[PDB]
Ligand SMILES: Clc1cc(-c2ccncc2)c(-c2ccccc2)nn1
């Protein structure tokens with residue numbers, strides 16, 4: 398029961414998709430792939446279709462293609478991008494060389510919004526609430542996003558929000574300091590730091606920490622939150638990092654009420670809990686959702702967690718054809734969601 402495909406060329410890329418998807422219109426592109434908005438005749442929905450770029454180019458790409466397909470097949474949550482469909486024009490494993498992913502079309506990203514609008518407190522609460530509700534789910538599957546930033550948050554005209562796990566200004570601006578320090582044992586709360594940076598930006602209209610490089614970025618972080626205290630200092634194994642850090646002029650933690658002057662004091666309070674230098678002390682997603690700032694949205698019986706996610710594949714060292722074959726299997730075993 399294979400559909401009928403049709404071929405077409407858009408912005409240099411060749412697109413071979415089933416007849417059900419019509420009016421392909423390019424939305425954008427990048428290193429990993431390109432996306433077209435389209436209309437899906439079978440559901441009456443507007444959808445986005447992503448064509449992966451060179452999915453089986455190297456062991457790295459093949460693994461990554463596998464990773465993305467596995468993740469997207471597992472994410473089933475209102476605030477996380479998931480899969481309506483996945484297909485390949487290939488008729489067998491031998492000719493398999495392209496992968497297309499389909500999801501609900503989301504017309505904008507949070508970057509398109511914060512930069513072309515000033516948001517009310519109510520919108521900040523709704524957007525951040527949704528980020529946290531999706532991160533709760535993601536984190537419950539032992540996944541760390543690691544790259545939250547405005548361009549990874551798809552938003553529609555209804556203000557509904559979904560976290561994009563894989564995309565296609567600077568990433569470092571939203572990155573937790575432990576990563577600017579290269580710590581190899583950072584946890585899920587790296588994502589909470591990013592959400593804090595995002596919330597700050599929606600509240601003020603300005604990037605909280607617009608570093609020019611990795612050093613400047615850490616310098617701007619410490620200027621707001623202060624240099625590490627003795628308890629945090631004790632956890633740094635790297636003699637170089639310690640030197641670097643103990644060798645800068647000491648700085649105190651600023652008063653967030655004075656820095657975020659005029660913002661709702663509940664939002665300020667939450668920010669303080671999110672932008673803690675010590676990751677062991679940052680608030681978690683589930684904790685943040687119960688914070689009083691979200692009383693008009695928080696509903697503990699409607700903040701689901703995820704089904705277990707098997708990430709053992711991540712520690713495997715396989716051949717391209719193996720990763721390719723595993724991916725083909727995932728394409729074939731796909732079951733779309735309900736009407
Ligand atoms: Cl940057 C980006 C955006 C999209 C997308 C999703 C929804 N609406 C518009 C754009 C996607 C994407 C991910 C999976 C399937 C299809 C597109 N992948 N990456």
Ligand SMILES: Fc1ccc(-c2n[nH]cc2-c2ccncc2)cc1
Nearest residue numbers: 574575578580625632633674675676
């Ligand atoms: F300057 C800084 C900035 C951040 C950290 C930090 N926060 N959470 C964890 C760490 C950390 C950094 C490096 N090694 C261990 C732990 C430590 C020092």
